[PDB]
Write an enzyme that holds these catalytic residues in place. Structure first.
Site, PDB file in Angstrom:
ATOM      1  N   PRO A  26      -4.546 109.459  -5.040  1.00 41.46           N
ATOM      2  CA  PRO A  26      -6.006 109.374  -5.131  1.00 41.46           C
ATOM      3  C   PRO A  26      -6.591 107.995  -4.883  1.00 41.46           C
ATOM      4  O   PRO A  26      -5.996 106.977  -5.223  1.00 41.46           O
ATOM      5  CB  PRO A  26      -6.284 109.861  -6.549  1.00 41.46           C
ATOM      6  CG  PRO A  26      -5.258 110.926  -6.728  1.00 41.46           C
ATOM      7  CD  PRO A  26      -4.003 110.272  -6.148  1.00 41.46           C
ATOM      8  N   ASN A  27      -7.764 107.979  -4.269  1.00 45.48           N
ATOM      9  CA  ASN A  27      -8.481 106.740  -4.002  1.00 45.48           C
ATOM     10  C   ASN A  27      -7.900 105.784  -2.979  1.00 45.48           C
ATOM     11  O   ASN A  27      -8.606 104.884  -2.504  1.00 45.48           O
ATOM     12  CB  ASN A  27      -8.725 106.028  -5.327  1.00 45.48           C
ATOM     13  CG  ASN A  27      -9.429 106.922  -6.310  1.00 45.48           C
ATOM     14  OD1 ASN A  27     -10.480 107.487  -5.997  1.00 45.48           O
ATOM     15  ND2 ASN A  27      -8.852 107.083  -7.494  1.00 45.48           N
ATOM     16  N   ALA A  86      -2.865 106.166  -9.181  1.00 45.40           N
ATOM     17  CA  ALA A  86      -3.181 106.516 -10.556  1.00 45.40           C
ATOM     18  C   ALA A  86      -2.428 107.724 -11.109  1.00 45.40           C
ATOM     19  O   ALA A  86      -2.264 107.852 -12.323  1.00 45.40           O
ATOM     20  CB  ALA A  86      -4.706 106.740 -10.692  1.00 45.40           C
ATOM     21  N   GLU A 124       9.453 104.462  -5.452  1.00 48.12           N
ATOM     22  CA  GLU A 124       8.068 104.353  -5.885  1.00 48.12           C
ATOM     23  C   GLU A 124       7.446 103.051  -5.382  1.00 48.12           C
ATOM     24  O   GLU A 124       8.001 101.969  -5.600  1.00 48.12           O
ATOM     25  CB  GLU A 124       8.029 104.393  -7.410  1.00 48.12           C
ATOM     26  CG  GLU A 124       6.779 104.983  -7.998  1.00 48.12           C
ATOM     27  CD  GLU A 124       6.593 104.560  -9.436  1.00 48.12           C
ATOM     28  OE1 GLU A 124       7.477 104.854 -10.271  1.00 48.12           O
ATOM     29  OE2 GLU A 124       5.562 103.920  -9.730  1.00 48.12           O
ATOM     30  N   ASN A 182       3.329 106.411  -3.077  1.00 48.07           N
ATOM     31  CA  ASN A 182       2.438 105.449  -3.723  1.00 48.07           C
ATOM     32  C   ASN A 182       1.571 106.398  -4.537  1.00 48.07           C
ATOM     33  O   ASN A 182       0.412 106.651  -4.214  1.00 48.07           O
ATOM     34  CB  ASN A 182       1.571 104.684  -2.721  1.00 48.07           C
ATOM     35  CG  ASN A 182       0.593 103.747  -3.411  1.00 48.07           C
ATOM     36  OD1 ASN A 182       0.011 102.862  -2.781  1.00 48.07           O
ATOM     37  ND2 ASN A 182       0.407 103.938  -4.718  1.00 48.07           N
ATOM     38  N   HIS A 238       3.907 100.504  -5.014  1.00 51.40           N
ATOM     39  CA  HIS A 238       2.584 100.130  -5.470  1.00 51.40           C
ATOM     40  C   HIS A 238       2.157  98.879  -4.720  1.00 51.40           C
ATOM     41  O   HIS A 238       2.966  97.984  -4.472  1.00 51.40           O
ATOM     42  CB  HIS A 238       2.586  99.923  -6.982  1.00 51.40           C
ATOM     43  CG  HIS A 238       2.725 101.203  -7.743  1.00 51.40           C
ATOM     44  ND1 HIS A 238       1.734 102.163  -7.767  1.00 51.40           N
ATOM     45  CD2 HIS A 238       3.773 101.731  -8.421  1.00 51.40           C
ATOM     46  CE1 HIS A 238       2.167 103.227  -8.421  1.00 51.40           C
ATOM     47  NE2 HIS A 238       3.402 102.992  -8.827  1.00 51.40           N
ATOM     48  N   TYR A 246      -9.699  92.427  -0.407  1.00 46.56           N
ATOM     49  CA  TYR A 246      -8.845  92.893   0.642  1.00 46.56           C
ATOM     50  C   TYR A 246      -9.666  93.572   1.736  1.00 46.56           C
ATOM     51  O   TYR A 246      -9.255  94.580   2.313  1.00 46.56           O
ATOM     52  CB  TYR A 246      -7.804  93.850   0.081  1.00 46.56           C
ATOM     53  CG  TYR A 246      -7.283  93.460  -1.274  1.00 46.56           C
ATOM     54  CD1 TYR A 246      -6.722  92.213  -1.502  1.00 46.56           C
ATOM     55  CD2 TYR A 246      -7.345  94.338  -2.312  1.00 46.56           C
ATOM     56  CE1 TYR A 246      -6.252  91.868  -2.745  1.00 46.56           C
ATOM     57  CE2 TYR A 246      -6.871  94.001  -3.544  1.00 46.56           C
ATOM     58  CZ  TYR A 246      -6.337  92.774  -3.758  1.00 46.56           C
ATOM     59  OH  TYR A 246      -5.898  92.505  -5.025  1.00 46.56           O
ATOM     60  N   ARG A 248     -15.177  97.962   1.648  1.00 43.37           N
ATOM     61  CA  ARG A 248     -16.100  96.907   1.233  1.00 43.37           C
ATOM     62  C   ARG A 248     -15.701  95.449   1.444  1.00 43.37           C
ATOM     63  O   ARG A 248     -15.918  94.582   0.585  1.00 43.37           O
ATOM     64  CB  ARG A 248     -16.641  97.070  -0.186  1.00 43.37           C
ATOM     65  CG  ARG A 248     -17.869  96.153  -0.445  1.00 43.37           C
ATOM     66  CD  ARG A 248     -19.236  96.804  -0.130  1.00 43.37           C
ATOM     67  NE  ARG A 248     -19.879  97.267  -1.362  1.00 43.37           N
ATOM     68  CZ  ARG A 248     -21.123  97.732  -1.463  1.00 43.37           C
ATOM     69  NH1 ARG A 248     -21.909  97.814  -0.398  1.00 43.37           N
ATOM     70  NH2 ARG A 248     -21.582  98.120  -2.648  1.00 43.37           N
ATOM     71  N   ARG A 302      -1.671  94.843 -14.516  1.00 40.20           N
ATOM     72  CA  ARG A 302      -2.923  95.506 -14.850  1.00 40.20           C
ATOM     73  C   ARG A 302      -2.892  96.164 -16.222  1.00 40.20           C
ATOM     74  O   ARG A 302      -2.062  95.817 -17.066  1.00 40.20           O
ATOM     75  CB  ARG A 302      -3.240  96.529 -13.763  1.00 40.20           C
ATOM     76  CG  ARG A 302      -3.273  95.900 -12.378  1.00 40.20           C
ATOM     77  CD  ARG A 302      -3.532  96.927 -11.292  1.00 40.20           C
ATOM     78  NE  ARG A 302      -4.813  97.603 -11.471  1.00 40.20           N
ATOM     79  CZ  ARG A 302      -5.227  98.635 -10.739  1.00 40.20           C
ATOM     80  NH1 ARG A 302      -4.462  99.122  -9.766  1.00 40.20           N
ATOM     81  NH2 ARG A 302      -6.407  99.186 -10.984  1.00 40.20           N
TER      82      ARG A 302
END
Lengths: 145, 145, 145, 145, 145, 145, 145, 144, 145, 150, 145, 150
Positions: free
Chosen positions: A10-11, A78, A99, A75, A101, A23, A18, A108
């Site tokens: 997601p996302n 979330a 996995e 990846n 990221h 980034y 932007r 975080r």
């Protein structure tokens, strides 16, 4: 000949919407292009997916085992902290996975340190960003040659 | 008039997707059919639903309020540890239910011991495989009749 | 000198001593030569250090800042779980580092899920054997050019 | 034939007192007969034990071994959450078993959500009154057919 | 030149879909039309959305960044406790939002206290039913000026 | 012809510094000599080693492997709660070891309850003073048969 | 005027049952038969005791008090992790005891790490088997003399 | 009477990236003013820094035989990790005060925990190097 | 036309067994005639009972439902932190009770801060030694009518 | 007998004391007179209150019982995390209440996520600044209407 | 009016009230006096305030802003563990503070290890008795230059 | 000569105030003459105090020490779970105390099970309604003559 499958959670889709400084100028596409390119140069197949829907990915993964995918580089975004279904999908299929990221998940929110995959993964790369995917593929191409 | 609704959460469709060795080997439908047979013979009309998308599972739960479904049997599998929205559905329509699990969740990883539905359901069964599904249908009935 | 320093935590000097199965055969100095070659093919200097004595490592890490090392690739081994000194050394010298592990740290005892290093590294590669060192060397070289 | 022992935890000997609308109609006797009558239907010599005493149940479990009992069905649960001696006997004689609770035990006080058996038990049943045993015993028999 | 998107999460469609005292008459659409008119009365445009699907709500809020939604009033519902996706979705687009719940989150089960959005919204309003939306909107209308 | 090694951890060299006040006049030198004599009077050779540096102990442990030591009787002392390196050293040389402690550890602070060595040791003697070394030796000799 | 009382917890009666190593040939009586023997060559009396009832060992420990037992060698087995009654019993009569476990308790499930007796025993032997009793007895001789 | 000041690992780094991260102050600087503080009170104080625990342990064993009365320690990192340091300190039984330049409580939680704090006479954190002086001023008043 | 039973848990019979105090001669014996007297002096029926055997105590309160009874005063002692069998034994007979303790639960080891009987009792009393029993009795007597 | 009582907890007096923006220029005074003005158009009588001492708030709440206050709008501030006393007070007098906070509480230190109050309130508003109070009012003002009849 | 403001929390007014070496004869007064003396040496104006009422302390912190106090040395005593309102008043007036305690808080009970003020203080002292306020003043004094 | 101090925490003043069917009309006032008459009956001096303000209570615990209160019976109310300030007030004055709660605190929210007082109290009594005070006073009364001897 034997397929590698790159799954994006997601996302990841919003990636690059932007720039200048967040980034800016990097997109989920820019990424898929490199990996696809890198997988080609060492003569291996690579398919990329993406949905903001957990049911969509669990689907894709059930298909990946059917499409003969050998090693998944995911990846989970979330969904790695919340989806045991994302785990029982990659395990239930018994495909090896690494996995990946972009961000250093450990740097975080603490609820981001927990994962439902990393322990059954061959390895985990976080924080190397896009290259994380690259290296993941590097190890994957050899892993089974 | 009546309707029982067995729902299956994610990955459950993968049942029997590599058979050796001597594991079990049964499919998602080997039970769906094992149930429907048991359903009618007792005068109640069953119904089954399965997806890996939580939304779907909710809407099928919702539409049951329109339908007039009297009690649900569910194996959310991975979802039982993760979806409360799923919980909100079964409570949102006031349709009772039972929760079943194929493997004995308590003998696996710890995280699999928590459940967002178990506490609300009439009951829970696990570790007996499919025999729990049908042990449930048995109770679903003796309650309505 | 474009120094990058490779540090191996304790017990790593024992890699390759019950050849057939346990860890198999990959000796510390086997990894050292590999890195040195990669290091030299990129025209980038790379000294290496191993010791079973934690203080030997911190001593090395300080010396590294003196020597103008641009980034540390550290395989703290048992120290990633127990050494804040190690963390504070690397933060003291402000030499960005990549934490690397041969085995998938998240697959072993829960106590190896914690790292006093990980949250402040650029990223972490684990479970990818010696290559971990190399990818780490790649990202690192490309970050310095 | 070949024996199944149906051990009962402390407090199941109680009853259905204040019988109308306390949910206390049936008694232990009414569960022990029903079942022994079901073992008759299965042509097994099924013996039962009810003791409020741990030491009577453990001793029982050891006799069961010498008497070559094949599988134990045990509803500890006032003992399920507290005793490992029970667990170590059920393992130390290595006779397989199943856990059963009349009430849904996850719908209650949080501390009932743990068990010293469930993990080393073939399966668990909770929530469906004394129908739960019949489910266990059924299963136990197919485990011998 | 301004727009307000209002997002209803899972199970919000059931308002008034069970008559007598269970949420009474007030339908999700009565809420919608009042809000529409309150918007219009002060020449603001306003849209409404509702879905039991995580991905869908996720998707439409992305559509919002494209549609120029100046602010989202959202009633995530059960997804506030599970979806870090939505958190990354709203964070991703960067559309300030307001959390609205009809019932009082805190009077319920412990897992409802936890929110993946609460800490990122402008503010939350829970427990005031429909009027909660009107207020958020009122504020949302004055916010823009 | 068989060599048994006895390793004393940090602070053990202190044995016999304030003799009557705490413990007794017994030393490392006695424990060692009585230990050697018991092994001479049994035809076994025995060496001993003590150190306050994890690295040295780690180092010694490595040489015992090359020296053909058959078993390590070790008193890690404080390292047992903090050294996952000490653990990995003994694991890496796979020389059966018996963990000894002069003092009873569980009688002390809560943190002294954790140990990175106890779950890998053949057995643990704690609290029986220096005999726990003789007993370890004795046991190790029956084992050397 | 020295007696030593050896106590064996629940299940220790089962020692040496499936002698084809689920654990070896060494039986409970053997242990006592070697213990009484060892004692005599030192002119020490020594009764022993085993039981599967919390009460029996409690009452038993109480009798040791009046019998003038100098020391107690006890293997509580699982009661060690669950009975504060055995604890208060031993502290009640105040006969120092050597807690002995044939198995290295620390290598098993987490709940076995806990113990309601260790902080109160003179010392603990775990994992050294039956020689552990002799060691206890050997230590128990010289301290009592 | 001899005080003994131990600095855990990484303290030898004080003042090595001068621009206002840290500052100009170094460990020898701290020792300099510390030994001085000691000599002003006619007390011999020896310092010892090592990024090595065994070295620090040995030092405190030697401190027993030497007859050291009290140790002012900044285990720095070793605080949250070394129970061997604890047992060493407890083993020779020489009282000690724990020092920390930065407020450990305003940082990461793993910082919050100390394997020494509970057995020290006291703790000082968040006041920069000034803490050794305070601890030393205290140490000194305990010996005179 | 009621009745009152008093229960003592394991180890109580050990009261006053090592002369001067720590209770110098207030044996359990004493505490019973005292409690009995007080009951025979306000004209109420009541029996006392103490056992080092859990099952006995549990049994003993089932005899409470067989004969009489309206209220139970109980000091489990060690079974307070351990037994949930005893808890349901009290709830099942449904006889409201009063929890009592000789020492201050809250002033001992943390493990003793948990009571299985406290949250259902009418009320609790601890730390008031003998007298505590006296109050429980007293509160009951002025409560039947 | 149809009053609404508004209660401000510790530190809420400090609104607008640093005029320049650590918050704006809004004071408790203003929030109230706006609330009062708003209560007047509806023909409803409203009162307000603030204190930095728990006891005083506990007292004013208790006093609202006797005044026949029908609904309390409360911004307890820091007190939601520590005061089970404030809690037992609103429950003591059984006056429904709406909890309001000017800032989004879940966006700060963990401990600040706990509350001995939120669960027993009618609803909670947090993050909306002063307007959070108005909504409480406008809501309360209706609330007096439904829940008949007699 | 006053540059530095010392706050003494509840119970510090009890200092010295039980003098014969239940602690030092040192009163809170003596401590104020000592600090005041010291502050007059550095020409700093110091004010003291003590109370057992949080509100009086908060009001004071508020009066403190309008007075223009530069630093607060505070020994919140008990309130360190429980007051967020004190927190909120200190942050609210935005006045920096050093926290102080006379006894080693880390040596006492766990609940004393927590602090609602430590993370926002400049520094904390504990265990050095009154000297701790000195050290803090001396620290404050230097900073206000 | 051996005075007992009875302390009631916040909100206890509300007792006896939705009278018809809930609790009773039994007021805190009522509970007090019961304890006063009980103390007077055994030749013991007994004082009572209630405040909705913690600081008022800590102050009074401090006064009790100088008053020579041999033992305190306290219904800390909501404060048993939050005031370590109250705990240290009691420990610092070193007056032994008995803790009374009307209701059974263990039968309520989990937060009501942690007490900053109990582990240092001689004993705890909760759930026995207002008679808990009576039983505490009972113990307190015989507790003033025990083995030294006498």
């Amino acid at each position: 000949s034997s397929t590698i499958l790159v799954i994006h959670g997601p996302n990841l889709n919003l990636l690059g919407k932007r720039e200048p400084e967040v980034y800016g100028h990097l997109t989920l596409d820019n990424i898929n292009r490199q990996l696809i390119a890198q997988a080609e140069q060492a003569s291996i197949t690579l398919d990329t997916f993406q949905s903001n829907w957990e049911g969509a990915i669990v689907d894709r993964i059930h298909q990946a085992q059917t499409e003969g995918v050998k090693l998944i580089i995911i990846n989970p975004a979330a969904l790695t902290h919340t989806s045991v279904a994302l785990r029982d999908a990659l395990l239930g299929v018994a495909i090896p996975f690494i996995e990946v990221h972009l961000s250093n998940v450990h740097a975080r929110e603490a609820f981001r340190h927990h994962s439902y995959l990393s322990d059954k993964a061959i390895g985990v790369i976080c924080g190397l960003g896009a290259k994380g995917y690259s290296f993941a593929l590097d190890y994957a191409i050899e892993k089974i040659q």
